[PDB]
Subunit: 145 residues, 2 copies
């Protein structure tokens, strides 16, 4: 999908290192996890590593823009149930009626909102750390038809 | 001081908003606090606000680069005692002998390290939140002769 044709929102979901999980701070080597999307069925996530937090975020954004997927959305929800599995993360995603909300943990909620989903039920069945939730939610999204 | 003549390191000290103090995350309006410096007596800090964390950090960096000060350092420490006061923050800074370390809380340690100080004793006498520690440490640094 060509990123440059899309107006993409960029969220920072996790930032690691100093007292390990900072979500954004200072001193020695850092990695950021970023999810970007256009609220209209196009999301991507990326990872970046550098000695400074701003560079690691800039690199995570360039990476996400290269890993953009397109997701089918019907109304405000997804066309059918799906189970994402990536590494230690595994998440069940189900259609919900207009009015439910994105019932999901924050890293997963980031991915769902930037894809443009507004009502969905999700059940985490594995690691709840950000990298695992994000990569498994992604995996689920890629399976929709 | 002209920023473009200096190789400046950029640290992110605080990021605010969603469940208020994120230090770096996702959803609605964000402010970042950034300290930049060259480890050779030039530090500046800045603040940025935007709906996305990367823009608020980019803006905090442009602001810090406009607010660069120059600090006298003798060896690895500061020439004399000083008390910074800005708002609810107040911090005492004292010379320490080679071998002490930057004995300071993290937001203050960020400012001292990027200025290039390596041994100093500091005693916080006020608000310990990042914006207060940073702006008061700054104030102290500006008083050195």
């Amino acid at each position: 999908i060509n990123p440059n044709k899309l107006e993409l929102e960029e969220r920072v979901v996790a930032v690691n290192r100093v007292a390990k999980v900072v979500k954004g701070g200072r001193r020695l080597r850092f990695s950021a996890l970023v999810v970007v999307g256009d609220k209209n069925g196009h999301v991507g996530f990326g990872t970046g590593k550098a000695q400074e937090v701003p560079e690691a975020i800039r690199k995570a954004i360039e990476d996400a823009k290269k890993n953009l997927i397109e997701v089918p959305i019907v109304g405000t929800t997804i066309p059918h149930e799906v189970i994402g599995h990536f590494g230690a993360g595994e998440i069940i995603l189900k259609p919900a009626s207009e009015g439910t909300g994105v019932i999901a943990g924050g890293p997963a909620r980031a991915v769902l909102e930037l894809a443009g989903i507004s009502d969905i039920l999700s059940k985490s069945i594995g690691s709840n750390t950000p990298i695992n939730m994000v990569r498994a939610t992604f995996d689920g999204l890629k399976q929709l038809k």
